[PDB]
Amino acid sequence: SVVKSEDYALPSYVDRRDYPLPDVAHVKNLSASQKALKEKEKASWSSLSIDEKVELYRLKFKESFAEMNRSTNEWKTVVGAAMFFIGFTALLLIWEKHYVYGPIPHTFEEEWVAKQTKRMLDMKVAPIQGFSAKWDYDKNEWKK
Amino acid sequence: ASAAKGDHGGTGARTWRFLTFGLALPSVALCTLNSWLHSGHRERPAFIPYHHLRIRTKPFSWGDGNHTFFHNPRVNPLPTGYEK
């Protein structure tokens, strides 16, 4: 049952799908009844009860395949916590925009943009696909 | 090449000392002779303030900042010309 730090050089127990039979038994010290059970196991296994069969399994192994292979709810904690700290990050960006950043250039004002946009079209910026191609120079509007 | 001599039977200390006194040092005495002969001050050339020479983009960290480290008055003009 109880594993110690300074036992690192000795064979150990592991529950792994691809290592079904570990180097040692899960339980190495047996009580009086456990000893009796290991003796009984030398006889026909048909004489072993369900509870005794289970008990022998548990001396040899720690978890069953179904146990070691079980899925968890950890993903909820990871994804949820991720989103939380990504959430936290917007608090920083809010603070930054309030206290650090001054106003942006006057060239983003609505009217400035309207005029600059006209000019871009007058100069046929990206006339093949990018920009002006998306303006109808006849109906005088953005292509629907 | 194989040079023009011989030994090779065994390359040991005696051979290498033979080479030291019989070939190497004699070559050095020859080139010492040749040199202490073709030497003697060659007439310094006319000064011309060429722009790719006597460079100064920052003064030197010694003397008056305008003299090269192993400045020789006889042969090394300053950016303005030879010295007095």
């Binding site: 799908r17 691809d18 400035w112 600059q116 871009m120 006339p127 093949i128 990018g130 | -």
Partner: protein
């Protein structure tokens, strides 16, 4: 110029720039394929409880994954080098124009016949006229004749700069003591923007390039009035 939210290349203004759009498309396809193939296989390997942990043999599958990528490289190189050698073909220019980089503006020299030269400086944001582009407008534009083969010679009189105009597929570094050549040829009239493309000190971000492409006849009159 670039427009808001732009994803890809500025529209081609020269035949060479068109050529690069197609080559980029061809390459990006290969790039999407292989990265999506890798992403896919990754997910394939991680989605089964079936296992096989014993030693696997490598000297057979290593052939495929050596020969395929080699082939795909050759399929990128072929068009890559074709365009490269095209960009180098002899072309016989009708006009030579020089540009000197300075901290922090460009000067132009049109010295085939007369001695024409001027400085080109970024319009300060506070002096932009309505609808003019922040950081991009210059006081004296680079008037050039459209539909003609021009020779652009580029150099610098202080630190490195680099003369770029993305819509024409141009970027020639400007190095003091050296004279770099490139050829320019706009298929269209108009205004074509670019920005200094080598870190050059305090105002590297603020020394743009505006080309004005008008007909020969308007270029000649402009030249004259500019003497």
């Amino acid at each position: 110029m670039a427009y808001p939210m732009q994803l890809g290349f500025q529209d081609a203004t020269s035949p060479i720039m068109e050529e690069l759009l197609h080559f980029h498309d061809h390459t990006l396809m290969i790039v999407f394929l292989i990265s999506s193939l890798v992403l896919y296989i990754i997910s394939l390997m991680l989605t089964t409880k079936l296992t096989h942990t014993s030693t696997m043999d490598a000297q057979e599958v290593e052939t495929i994954w050596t020969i395929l990528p080699a082939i795909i490289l050759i399929l990128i190189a072929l068009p890559s080098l074709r365009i490269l050698y095209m960009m180098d073909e002899i072309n016989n220019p009708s006009l030579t124009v020089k540009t000197m980089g300075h901290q922090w503006y460009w000067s132009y020299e049109y010295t085939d016949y007369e001695d024409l030269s001027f400085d080109s400086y970024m319009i300060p944001t506070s002096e932009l006229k309505p609808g003019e582009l922040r950081l991009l407008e210059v006081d004296n534009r680079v008037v050039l004749p459209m539909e003609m083969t021009i020779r652009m010679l580029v150099s610098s009189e202080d630190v490195l700069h680099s003369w770029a105009v993305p819509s024409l597929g141009l970027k020639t570094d400007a190095i003091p003591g050296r004279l770099n050549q490139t050829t320019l040829m706009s298929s269209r009239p108009g205004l074509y923007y670019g920005q200094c493309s080598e870190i050059c000190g305090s105002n590297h971000s603020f020394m743009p390039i505006v080309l004005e492409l008008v007909p020969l006849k308007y270029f000649e009159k402009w030249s004259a009035s500019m003497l």
